[PDB]
């Protein structure tokens, strides 16, 4: 058994040939070696140190070629030969990664053994053109009402999740995955997002908790977890999104739709910062060398809503930069903001205020689409925005507690109820068919009257009532996804039926 597998392994090694490249290590220490020789070295190629370390080579110099070690310092020894793998970095890409945690080099670190990847690919694949795009029309619903309504998410679209560290920073993304369980459960393959959660700089225990949560929500099956743990090397951390991207591109290429969460790119940037300064490259703005923008841009532009030619397969991206002190003027946050098609600002103060999820909606934007959300939901949340916009001004007047105009305090009264409606406890998403009623009630002002304290009570009960009686109404919202006159009236009657009583 184990003997048989070993017998296969023993059989699996025999014979080798002349090594036409060499170079003798000299520098070693600082975990970045620089070796003398190597002229056959094709750039970005993977070079096998005779210690057993592999390091790709990112700096070529007519003195000493700078091979970034993945492995340990002590194993490498000065004067060792390195023999070129002769292959630029590549990862196995396929569908075998579905239900797998993998480290940066694509080794199953969950130890569910080998991966049934249908290829290997290169991590430096470039972003598809203008012509290979198609118009975006693929809604994505996170189960958090505010996200769908305020910042509607399409596919092939970049939305940057930004805000203070670990304010359930991970949790916001996980919520999306959970409502995307509904589409995943749904047999529509192109609506099945094979979700790729990339975890950079995080400890094994945190990750272990995350995989436990995902396995608990049994979403792990379609999830791929690409990891670059806190332990894992700085080159490997830099390489981890780009190889995650390759796995995603296999889905995208196939016409399959998928979603890539890049959590947190801020730690990737630190990794490149370290890497570059120990390639002795001059420090950039905030010690991230400029061309970091180039690095990030090529990575991010591989999220694309491709043409019908390419099977419509759209990898969707959600970058995550955990801004320290909300410092968006920091070079990497400024850079990313420009690249991304939305920003989803979150705010700690609003967390403390008890708004959980805590979203700074003023700076949360989605510059792209509205076919990035449901037509029905577009109709109802049309003036959710208006009410909220009025609410922002009104709230300012309300502060300092000056005697409000009755009209402004009407807005204030309406607005408050909406705010309580938005809040949702982590790991509880909501199905869109039942987010349309709640927003209908609020927007059609039926909730404006209902007192703030019992809005939460009301919300729960309203849902129960609709499950009992107007479940026909829910079925129709599910089935037709655009509120018709009949649905608006039916819904109005239903809402009236439970708002009164």
């Amino acid at each position: 058994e184990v003997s048989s597998i070993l017998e296969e392994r023993i059989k699996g090694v025999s014979d080798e040939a002349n090594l036409n490249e060499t170079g003798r290590v000299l520098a070693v220490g600082d975990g970045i070696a620089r070796v003398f020789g190597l002229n056959n070295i094709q750039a970005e190629e993977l070079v096998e140190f005779s210690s057993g370390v592999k390091g790709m080579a990112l700096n070529l110099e007519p003195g000493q070629v700078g091979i970034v070690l993945f492995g340990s310092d002590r194993l490498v020894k000065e004067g060792e030969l390195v023999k070129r793998t002769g292959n630029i970095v590549d990862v196995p890409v396929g569908p075998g990664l579905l239900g797998r945690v993998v480290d940066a080099l694509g080794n199953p670190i969950d130890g569910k053994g080998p991966i049934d990847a249908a290829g290997r690919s290169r991590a430096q694949v470039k972003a598809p053109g203008i012509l290979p795009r198609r118009s975006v029309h693929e809604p994505v619903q996170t189960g958090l009402k505010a996200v769908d309504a305020l910042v509607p998410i399409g596919r092939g679209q970049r939305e940057l999740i930004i805000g203070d560290r670990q304010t359930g920073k991970t949790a916001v993304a996980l919520d999306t995955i959970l409502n995307q369980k509904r589409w995943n459960n749904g047999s529509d393959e192109s609506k099945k997002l094979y979700c790729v959660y990339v975890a950079v700089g995080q400890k094994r225990s945190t990750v272990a908790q995350l995989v436990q949560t995902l396995e608990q929500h049994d979403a792990m099956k379609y999830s791929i977890i690409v990891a670059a743990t806190a332990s894992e090397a700085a080159p490997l951390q830099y390489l981890a999104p780009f190889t995650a991207a390759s796995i995603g591109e296999w889905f995208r290429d196939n016409g399959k739709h998928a979603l890539i969460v890049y959590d947190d790119l801020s730690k990737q940037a630190v990794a490149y910062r370290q890497l570059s300064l120990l390639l002795r490259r001059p420090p950039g703005r905030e010690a991230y060398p400029g061309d970091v923008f180039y690095l990030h841009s090529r990575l991010l532009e591989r999220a694309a809503k491709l043409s019908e030619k390419e099977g419509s397969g759209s990898l969707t991206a959600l970058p995550v930069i955990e801004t320290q002190g909300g410092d968006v003027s920091a070079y990497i946050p400024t850079n990313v903001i420009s690249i991304t098609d939305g920003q989803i600002f979150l705010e700690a103060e609003l967390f403390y205020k008890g708004i959980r999820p805590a979203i700074n909606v003023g700076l949360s934007v989605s510059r792209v689409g509205s076919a990035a959300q449901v037509k029905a939901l577009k109709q109802v949340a049309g003036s959710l925005k208006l009410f909220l916009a009025q609410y922002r001004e009104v709230a300012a007047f309300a502060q300092f507690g000056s005697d409000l105009d009755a009209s402004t305090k009407q807005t204030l009264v309406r607005g408050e109820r909406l705010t309580q409606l938005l809040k949702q406890n982590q790991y509880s998403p909501l199905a869109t068919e039942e987010q349309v009623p709640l927003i209908y009630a609020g927007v059609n002002g039926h909730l404006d009257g209902i007192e703030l304290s019992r809005i939460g009570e009301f919300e729960s009960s309203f849902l129960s009532y609709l499950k009992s009686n107007h479940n026909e109404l829910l079925t129709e919202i599910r089935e037709k996804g655009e509120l018709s006159k009949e649905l608006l009236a039916s819904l109005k009657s239903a809402t009236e039926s439970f708002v009164a009583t």
Partner: protein, 469 residues
């Protein structure tokens, strides 16, 4: 190996040796320079080629003459571990700096070790009652948990830790490690004396605690592997002895700080705010070596002397990456006379939840946070105007927040002496009950001062009677 060498350079405590013979050392090897100052331990950190290494120097430097023999003692320094290390204060070389005579031991182990794998993990977090209301409410502790303190300049970072040790580690029978990195000698004498006195170290007897203490004065390089030494002691307990573990680390700003000093000298471009580009690898490694495994779930407590209280400085920022709870303590809140001095809107725990400590607990905490955040919001209005120019509803909230704040003032136990007020320790079950009532304003009608510097709700009531008298 007998790799002879010379000391080519002594550029600070980053001595460079020229190993005369072309016999090669390896990175993380250890070398003994034998001097009338006894052995001096160096650790190979670069090979610059031509058999000219650049070596970190652990022990003190001075007197060195260029062209001085080196001998390679190889590998990572070997500490001594066993149950017979329990009760000792250990240098880094295994020497008893509490001078209990050569540390009796079983197996002596290399300082450097690998961080347990993703597969090796077995992550679990219980509830752990600290007997401190603010801690329990805002950040419920857990077994195997990673706690972090981002306190001042030992203004009571030490006090906080000492109280925690007094409660938790004398309520934990399993092994516990105190590793004190670059901390003042007097604190060590006080702690040692206290430990011996409180029998946690029975001097003649056995100790359920072990101690590693690294003095601030000691060269930076020594402080760097003071931590690594401690991690080995912990690993032996965790793994080989198998027993339940705890670990306390203070001051781990010094760990970071020491690293940044050597980095520049080593010849590494020191990244932003002068902090080493290898900050991330080191913090990561330490916190991936201290990790919850099936071998043992290691409760760690880390105390960061936030430098000038800037937590956005990269070293506190990277600490946040590997923590599961934080209890950031504000120097300002200490000045207000609140002891505990923990910032309450900057406390978090993964174990604070609506089912991890129950919906009732979560709701109670939520309201406290909301109330305080409102109060913080109305600080502007209160100051520019007054509290009589605040709305009545708000004035109730403000009065409640002031009461809650004062309620949080709860005397310290170890520092019952230092504060001068008998310590107030309160059970978790009691805490949930107490805050629920207060939030329902049932006890909000009695002096704010009554709430000030006392324990549980019953204690507030009794102090109201005292104030009434």
């Amino acid at each position: 190996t007998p790799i002879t060498g010379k000391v080519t350079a002594v550029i600070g405590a980053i001595v460079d040796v020229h190993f005369e013979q072309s016999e090669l050392p390896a990175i993380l090897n250890a070398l003994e320079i034998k001097t009338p100052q006894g052995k001096l331990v160096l650790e190979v950190a670069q090979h610059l080629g031509e058999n000219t290494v650049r070596t970190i120097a652990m022990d003190g430097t001075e007197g060195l003459v260029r062209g001085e023999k080196v001998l390679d003692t190889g590998g990572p320094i070997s500490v001594p571990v066993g149950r017979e290390t329990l009760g000792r204060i250990i240098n880094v070389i295994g020497e008893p700096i509490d001078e209990r005579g050569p540390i009796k031991s079983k197996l002596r182990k290399p300082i450097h070790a690998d961080p347990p794998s993703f597969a090796e993990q077995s992550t679990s977090a219980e509830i752990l009652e600290t007997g401190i209301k603010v801690v329990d409410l805002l950040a419920p502790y857990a077994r195997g948990g990673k706690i972090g303190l981002f306190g001042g300049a030992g203004v009571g970072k030490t006090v906080f830790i000492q109280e925690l040790i007094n409660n938790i580690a004398k309520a934990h029978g399993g092994f516990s490690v105190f590793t004190g990195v670059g901390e003042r000698t007097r604190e060590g004498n006080d702690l040692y004396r206290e430990m011996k006195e409180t029998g946690v170290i029975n001097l003649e007897g056995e100790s359920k605690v072990a101690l590693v203490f690294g003095q601030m004065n000691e060269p930076p390089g020594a402080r760097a592997r003071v931590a690594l030494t401690g991690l080995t002691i912990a690993e032996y307990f965790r793994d080989e002895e198998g027993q339940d573990v705890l670990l306390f680390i203070d001051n781990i700003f010094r760990f970071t700080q020491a690293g940044s000093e050597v980095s520049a000298l080593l010849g590494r471009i020191p990244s932003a705010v002068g902090y080493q580009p290898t900050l991330a690898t080191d913090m990561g490694l330490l916190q991936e070596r201290i990790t919850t495994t099936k071998k043992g779930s290691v409760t760690s407590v880390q105390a960061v002397y936030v430098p000038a209280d800037d937590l956005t400085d990269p070293a506190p920022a990277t600490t946040f990456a590997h923590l599961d709870a934080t209890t950031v303590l504000s120097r300002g809140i200490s000045e207000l006379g609140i002891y505990p001095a923990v910032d309450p809107l900057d406390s978090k725990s993964r174990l604070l939840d609506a089912a991890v400590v129950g919906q009732e607990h979560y709701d109670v905490a939520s309201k406290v946070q909301e109330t305080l955040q409102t109060y913080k919001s109305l600080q502007d209005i209160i100051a520019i105007l007054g509290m009589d120019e605040l709305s009545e509803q708000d004035k109730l909230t403000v009065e409640r927040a002031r009461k809650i704040q004062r309620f949080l003032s709860q005397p310290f136990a170890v520092a019952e002496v230092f504060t001068g007020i008998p310590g107030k320790l309160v059970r978790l079950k009691d805490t949930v009950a107490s805050f629920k009532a207060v939030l329902e304003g049932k006890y909000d009608n009695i002096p704010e001062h009554a709430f000030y510097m006392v324990g549980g709700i019953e204690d507030v009531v009794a102090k109201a009677e005292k104030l009434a008298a």
